[PDB]
């Protein structure tokens, strides 16, 4: 999904292995704030949210807690107290296109700043000039920003990047999102220390 209308998915009641991905070494950006990223699927949260969108490399630095700029103020904003992770990888081979891929749009105008992570639900028009627009996009009254021009022969700052933001919800509820149960082989006829799943 484009950054103005990013896609949030809730995840609960399942087994997750983070070290396959965190240790996969396949992403260009993997920054975790709050929780340690290094093999800390030894925790259990109520819900896990995954927010997916598309930006450009120049803007990847703007998808971060308490960041300011076009995308952060107008497209996707994260709060400073972000207890989560951000992953991102260059998708020029998948989101570019000969003659340009113009499918991703970004919001360029807003009266205020974005209140921690919202998306292009209400997508109206905003007055960007002196007096009322009263209709057809025109003089001192237009659209937000255009499409992204993700041509494959772009500079890195202009190339498409796919971003997934994972948030970890731990409310006053039974936590169900845990990761592995590293079982071991069993033995017999010898005094041992045991841990029989609890």
């Amino acid at each position: 999904a484009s950054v103005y209308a990013w896609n949030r998915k809730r995840i609960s009641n399942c087994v997750a292995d983070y070290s396959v991905l965190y240790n996969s070494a396949s992403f260009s950006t993997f920054k975790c704030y709050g929780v340690s990223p290094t093999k800390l699927n030894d925790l259990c949260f109520t819900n896990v949210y995954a927010d997916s969108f598309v930006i450009r490399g120049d803007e990847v630095r703007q998808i971060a807690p308490g960041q300011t700029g076009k995308i952060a103020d107008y497209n996707y904003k994260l709060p400073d107290d972000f207890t989560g992770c951000v992953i991102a990888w260059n998708s020029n081979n998948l989101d570019s296109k000969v003659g340009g891929n113009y499918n991703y749009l970004y919001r360029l105008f807003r009266k205020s700043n974005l209140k921690p992570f919202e998306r292009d639900i209400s997508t109206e028009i905003y007055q960007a000039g002196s007096t009322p627009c009263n209709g057809v996009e025109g003089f001192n009254c237009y659209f937000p920003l255009q499409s992204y021009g993700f041509q494959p022969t772009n500079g890195v700052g202009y190339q498409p990047y796919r971003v997934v933001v994972l948030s970890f919800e731990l409310l006053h509820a039974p936590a169900t999102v845990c990761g592995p149960k590293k079982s071991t082989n069993l033995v017999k006829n010898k005094c041992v220390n045991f841990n029989f799943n609890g």
Epitope: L108, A128, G129, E137, Q146
Partner: antibody
């Protein structure tokens, strides 16, 4: 990388309709907020704004010449045509067409200045004489 | 009415300060939408030299400055150099005519 080229008749008689064509490259007249304008320069004088057209077919003309000036676009050929009715020898001058890149200077206030000020790129110009 | 007023020429010797005035009306230089300055050879595409009364586009030497007050504006060239031998035009939107009005222009020569 931006090119503009004006074409038309070098001599027109008074009261007749003048048709000038501007062929451009380096930009599309279909881009959001992009503009295409016409400007005149009378003999040995300063530049005089004539009219402007937008990607959305909106257009303005100088009020004193509004009723006699008409600008049209042809997206398929990336061309702009200017027609001037009831011409007179007073309209003899060099005509320039020009590109206006989306809104204003987007960096700095967010292009929140009508149209910044004007344009940048220019064509070679065409001299049109009105006489019978 | 349709034209901003500039002195038709301004001169000086290399290294001098040369200023160009630009006389408008209430609707453009006065209560209008700021005055810009242009610098390009006669008959060739102009190039923005000063924007928003006093901003400079990148590529314009820092020695070009603009000023506005009331219905009058000026361009200052602070250390006239051989490259400054061009035409200079001021320009501003006129709210009464609803037109973007250029100045009549000034040619500088480095004597």
């Amino acid at each position: 990388e931006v090119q503009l080229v004006e074409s038309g008749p070098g001599l027109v008689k008074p009261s007749e309709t003048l048709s000038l064509t501007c062929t451009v490259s380096g930009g599309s007249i279909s881009s959001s907020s992009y503009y295409w304008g016409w400007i005149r320069q009378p003999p040995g004088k300063g530049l005089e704004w004539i009219g402007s057209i937008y990607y959305r077919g909106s257009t303005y003309y100088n009020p004193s010449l509004k009723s006699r000036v008409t600008i049209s676009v042809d997206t398929s050929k990336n061309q702009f045509s200017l027609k001037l009715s009831s011409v007179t020898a007073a309209d003899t001058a060099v005509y320039y067409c020009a590109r206006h890149v989306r809104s204003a200077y987007y960096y700095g206030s967010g292009s929140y200045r009508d149209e910044g000020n004007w344009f940048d790129p220019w064509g070679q110009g065409t001299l049109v004489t009105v006489s019978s | 009415q349709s034209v901003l007023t500039q002195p038709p020429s301004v001169s000086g010797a290399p290294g001098q300060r040369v200023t160009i005035s630009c006389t408008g009306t209430r609707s453009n230089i006065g209560a209008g939408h700021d005055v810009h300055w242009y610098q390009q050879l006669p008959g060739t595409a102009p190039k923005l030299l000063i924007y928003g009364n006093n901003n400079r586009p990148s590529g314009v030497p820092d020695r070009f400055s603009g000023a506005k007050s009331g219905t009058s504006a000026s361009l200052a060239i602070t250390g006239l150099q051989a490259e400054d031998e061009a035409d200079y035009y001021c320009q501003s939107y006129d709210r009464t005519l609803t037109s973007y009005v250029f100045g009549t222009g000034t040619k500088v020569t480095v004597l």
